[PDB]
Design a protein around this nucleic acid. Sequence first.
DNA 1: CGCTACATGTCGTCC
DNA 2: GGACGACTTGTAGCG
Lengths: 239, 239
Amino acid sequence: SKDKVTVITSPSTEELVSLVNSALLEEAMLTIFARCKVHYDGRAKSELGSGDRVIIVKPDGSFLIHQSKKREPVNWQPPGSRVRLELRENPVLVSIRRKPRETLEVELEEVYMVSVFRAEDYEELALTGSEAEMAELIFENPEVIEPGFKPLFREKAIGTGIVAVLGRDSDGNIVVLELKRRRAELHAVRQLKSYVEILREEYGDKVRGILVAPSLTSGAKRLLEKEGLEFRKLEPPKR
Amino acid sequence: SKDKVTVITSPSTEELVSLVNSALLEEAMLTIFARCKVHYDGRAKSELGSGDRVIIVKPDGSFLIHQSKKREPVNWQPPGSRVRLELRENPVLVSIRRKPRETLEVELEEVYMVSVFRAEDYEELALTGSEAEMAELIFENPEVIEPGFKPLFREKAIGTGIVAVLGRDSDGNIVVLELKRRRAELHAVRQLKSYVEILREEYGDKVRGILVAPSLTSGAKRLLEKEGLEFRKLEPPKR
DNA sequence: CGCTACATGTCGTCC
DNA sequence: GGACGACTTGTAGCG
Ligand SMILES: [Mg+2]
Ligand SMILES: [Mg+2]
């Protein structure tokens, strides 16, 4: 029980309970391969008929059921649920949460494998090419937006909404930027347009919105043009 | 290669290679508990240092690296990626994707366990309490909105944007509905306000927007009132 | 906790 | 294929 991994194929009920319960109390990762039915009631409600899936219960409460396809678990519960194995006509893995109140029930018809992974990880993801990274590049070197641009505020509350960057231009105007790290879609324009209508109300018609992004969709460009907003092409930088 | 599950703890290199290549070829699920490093370059860029993780490869090319916390894999590749094992100074799992170009590299420093799960699942999820379900309700029972409300279109392309439900009211006004399955946000009122604007362009002052959802955030309420749009509290049905 | 907006979002789905 | 919007979205950042 200090070995990183413990594994049992075609486990007996005793062995199942032993590992399942040990991992939950040991703050370790539980992985299971089983034919199962799944029952979810919570924010929404779902039923999943009998079939083979991979099941993961992380020490933080995260509960995953993965089918042989997609990138998303077919069913899940997010970090913070309380999980318990429950012996019934079949074993039943049960995830409970109270805000919001949600129940996830996994019923194990046949467990092919149960396993305990006592995983030691002190390390964190270091990612670049984000919106945050664009915002940094614009404050270090405002030249990328345009000559004379002076950035002032990052993630600024206005009365309704939060603007990514608020600044001033060489004509002394108020400028709003909305940044997108990938091709900007319609809703980016709605955001930007919303912010700009709001500030025009205090500061006048001279306020400029600019959408900053590596490209636009057609609809983006269309609404951006209909509304008299602007576009500066900027790629998110990779450190 | 017949049994539903194969497990080899502390595999050797030939064992590792043998199992991984069987997995991929057989359209089984590959599961590896391992100490690894992860290198990602693609839409964005990252480096994950040495640590214990659960790696999954699904037969449709989904590639997941899970740490012992949260619901999201720390690194991942969506379906369609092409996976393979390469023998470098360490064995290295490699995920390539074209359109967009992405590389995901998982360097296996030490593999505690490796497993192949030849998994059979023919059943899909059946979910209720969605936005679709709300819309079906409104079409079966429009009086849930208001008496003398006639629905016409669902998920209808307006000039710019797609409206959720479009119809008329008893007084000859045009009615846009924006539906939400949970408490509505600023995002929701911006959507509504956009649609209502684009439709006033044509049919004039005869357009009403109605935001339909179980509740509203403060800001969404604030903004709703300001631009003079309306609200019907409605919960999605669970059937 | 509630609000706001990003994400390597992923995923269905209308033209 | 490109555009567009939902999702049990999850997740961080702030107040
Ligand atoms: Mg923003
Ligand atoms: Mg909508």
